[PDB]
Amino acid sequence: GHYQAEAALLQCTADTLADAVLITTAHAWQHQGKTLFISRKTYRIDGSGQMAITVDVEVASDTPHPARIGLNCQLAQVAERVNWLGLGPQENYPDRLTAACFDRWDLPLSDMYTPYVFPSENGLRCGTRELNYGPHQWRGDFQFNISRYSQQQLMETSHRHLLHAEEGTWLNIDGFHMGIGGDDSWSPSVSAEFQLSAGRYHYQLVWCQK
Amino acid sequence: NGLVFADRTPHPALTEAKHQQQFFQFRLSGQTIEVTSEYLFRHSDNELLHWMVALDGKPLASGEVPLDVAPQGKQLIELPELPQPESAGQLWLTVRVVQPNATAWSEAGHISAWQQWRLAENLSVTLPAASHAIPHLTTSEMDFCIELGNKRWQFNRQSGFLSQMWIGDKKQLLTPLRDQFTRAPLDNDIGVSEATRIDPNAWVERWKAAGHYQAEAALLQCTADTLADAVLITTAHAWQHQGKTLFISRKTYRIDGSGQMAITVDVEVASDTPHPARIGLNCQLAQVAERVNWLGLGPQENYPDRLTAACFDRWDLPLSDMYTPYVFPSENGLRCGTRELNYGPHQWRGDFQFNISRYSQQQLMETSHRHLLHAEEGTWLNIDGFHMGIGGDDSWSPSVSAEFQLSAGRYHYQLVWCQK
Numbered sequence: 001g002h003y004q005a006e007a008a009l010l011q012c013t014a015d016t017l018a019d020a021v022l023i024t025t026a027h028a029w030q031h032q033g034k035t036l037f038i039s040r041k042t043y044r045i046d047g048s049g050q051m052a053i054t055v056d057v058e059v060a061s062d063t064p065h066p067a068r069i070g071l072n073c074q075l076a077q078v079a080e081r082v083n084w085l086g087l088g089p090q091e092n093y094p095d096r097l098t099a100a101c102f103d104r105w106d107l108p109l110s111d112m113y114t115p116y117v118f119p120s121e122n123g124l125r126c127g128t129r130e131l132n133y134g135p136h137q138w139r140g141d142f143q144f145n146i147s148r149y150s151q152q153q154l155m156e157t158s159h160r161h162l163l164h165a166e167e168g169t170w171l172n173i174d175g176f177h178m179g180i181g182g183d184d185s186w187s188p189s190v191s192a193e194f195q196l197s198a199g200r201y202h203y204q205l206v207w208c209q210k
Numbered sequence: 211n212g213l214v215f216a217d218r219t220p221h222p223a224l225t226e227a228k229h230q231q232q233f234f235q236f237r238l239s240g241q242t243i244e245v246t247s248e249y250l251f252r253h254s255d256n257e258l259l260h261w262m263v264a265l266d267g268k269p270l271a272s273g274e275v276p277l278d279v280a281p282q283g284k285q286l287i288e289l290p291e292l293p294q295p296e297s298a299g300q301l302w303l304t305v306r307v308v309q310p311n312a313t314a315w316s317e318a319g320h321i322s323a324w325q326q327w328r329l330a331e332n333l334s335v336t337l338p339a340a341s342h343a344i345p346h347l348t349t350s351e352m353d354f355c356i357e358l359g360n361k362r363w364q365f366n367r368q369s370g371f372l373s374q375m376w377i378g379d380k381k382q383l384l385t386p387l388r389d390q391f392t393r394a395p396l397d398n399d400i401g402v403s404e405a406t407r408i409d410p411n412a413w414v415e416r417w418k419a420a421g422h423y424q425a426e427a428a429l430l431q432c433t434a435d436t437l438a439d440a441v442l443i444t445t446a447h448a449w450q451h452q453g454k455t456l457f458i459s460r461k462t463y464r465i466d467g468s469g470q471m472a473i474t475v476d477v478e479v480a481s482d483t484p485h486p487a488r489i490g491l492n493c494q495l496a497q498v499a500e501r502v503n504w505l506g507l508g509p510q511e512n513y514p515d516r517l518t519a520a521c522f523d524r525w526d527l528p529l530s531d532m533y534t535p536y537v538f539p540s541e542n543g544l545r546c547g548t549r550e551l552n553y554g555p556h557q558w559r560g561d562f563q564f565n566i567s568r569y570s571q572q573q574l575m576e577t578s579h580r581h582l583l584h585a586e587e588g589t590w591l592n593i594d595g596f597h598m599g600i601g602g603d604d605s606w607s608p609s610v611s612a613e614f615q616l617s618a619g620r621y622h623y624q625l626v627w628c629q630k
């Protein structure tokens with residue numbers, strides 16, 4: 001039920017602090033009575049404009065290990081360049097990143113999409129500490145991909161030429177992302193060390209305007 | 211260098227050896243347990259399999275099946291339909307091979323083999339009924355204090371640490387709750403290094419040279435905030451040696467109306483400092499209690515690279531059984547994969563490793579022989595989010611495998627401290 005599980009709100013509170021507003025949330029993703037995931041978050045918005053997002057996820061030990069643990073959203077902005085401090089310049093995944101180098105990379109948005117003839121998840125960059133897109137900056141220690149194509153359109157479309165740019169920009173920021181595998185392509189080939197099997201996961205992000 | 215002490219009392223390592231050298235191998239597929247014999251000549255004619263399913267330590271179902279396996283052969287055992295759990299949590303299957311009859315070498319009832327698997331887990335979604343009580347923050351120049359009934363929490367604003375806790379008029383701490391990144395070095399940490407002939411490559415010497423044992427905590431931040439139903443303390447410390455920042459620890463402490471203190475810890479480890487022996491907290495508790503009760507791996511001492519023999523269950527031992535009397539004293543008695551710990555009035559919950567004893571890490575590292583150790587006032591508690599492997603491939607060069615070194619750079623753990 002991973003693709004169809006719906007978020008159920010458990011808690012959503014706000015507190016005013018000395019120099020910040022704290023939003024605390026908790027969600028459960030359920031499928032036919034079974035709780036697959038729990039997400040607990042705090043968002044701390046301080047007097048300097050920065051929003052600190054803290055995320056703690058629980059994954060049911062008996063559910064198949066998830067493909068990723070992260071956030072996504074469709075940004076209204078369509079910008080020309082993507083600038084990041086992380087691994088690159090090319091697409092890299094946790095079990096395929098040795099060739100990537102850590103540095104300051106700046107590419108046109110189109111290079112952040114890999115035109116695989118059969119469309120899929122693509123264009124991830126790992127080990128990223130800073131991401132810049134238009135007025136937005138995200139900081140932390142994350143994997144990201146960024147394109148005009150939603151994960152939904154990608155999984156519903158069977159040929160790259162049938163893809164259409166969506167309004168704005170789809171951003172996927174992952175704390176964790178499963179390996180891609182490839183020892184073969186007819187049986188699961190992602191190695192145990194690259195499967196998201198730890199049960200509890202923590203990542204944190206700072207979102208601000210630069 | 212023995213698996214047993216000179217008087218033939220076992221070291222903890224002996225049980226790891228016993229488990230790994232088992233003559234029966236197990237796989238689980240759905241309801242089916244597959245048992246494989248590693249005997250070459252004998253049939254399993256003195257063996258029965260005991261199985262037990264427990265929910266976070268509470269027995270749900272159990273049974274017996276006689277083993278009937280040819281040498282190098284296999285046997286399939288179909289578990290019956292299990293009654294579904296009544297509450298949230300993780301179901302665990304434990305199997306044990308038992309010898310019903312005495313032999314020339316063993317007593318009737320001898321356990322020769324065991325194995326555990328996680329079964330269904332049902333995650334807790336139902337929020338606890340919101341307590342009516344609200345804690346109160348008392349702010350002064352030197353302290354943040356939180357009160358709730360007979361309970362009081364004191365945070366020193368000069369140091370940044372929980373320096374004291376009161377239940378009634380009784381102090382609960384002899385030493386402030388502080389981060390700890392070192393251990394009393396094991397024989398494997400030391401190797402052939404000596405005061406008169408330093409081995410710069412040994413773990414203990416890298417830790418010493420980097421200033422791990424002499425690092426001083428510098429307070430970066432200490433703030434307090436009142437929420438609707440809780441008090442929130444935020445701290446940040448930098449551990450430094452000779453102007454070099456080794457570790458940074460950022461914490462929040464959330465105390466609510468139920469008197470539960472939620473501690474969140476986030477640690478940065480400088481990439482060019484030798485990987486630390488542990489990432490945890492420690493304090494000297496005022497209480498000395500008779501029993502230690504925990505839900506986690508046990509019953510014996512187990513470390514991250516030596517815990518395959520340990521089983522997840524509910525364990526209850528006298529305090530003295532939580533100290534391993536190695537003739538050369540070192541870090542000892544750790545239990546890993548622990549979700550709940552109980553000692554006197556205290557309970558800690560989370561996902562941690564711990565040791566608990568009357569000896570500080572400082573005394574263990576300064577004392578060369580076990581008979582020279584003295585019980586200190588109260589009880590020393592080390593609770594680790596992370597602990598380095600112990601190694602042992604040899605004892606004269608670094609031998610902790612890369613996957614058991616604390617090299618991730620950033621670490622997160624979380625604990626809830628409450629009164630039982």
Ligand code: NA
Binds near residue numbers: 118154155157158
């Ligand atoms: Na597709």
Ligand code: NA
Binds near residue numbers: 255
């Ligand atoms: Na038998």
Ligand code: NA
Binds near residue numbers: 538540574577578
């Ligand atoms: Na010692």
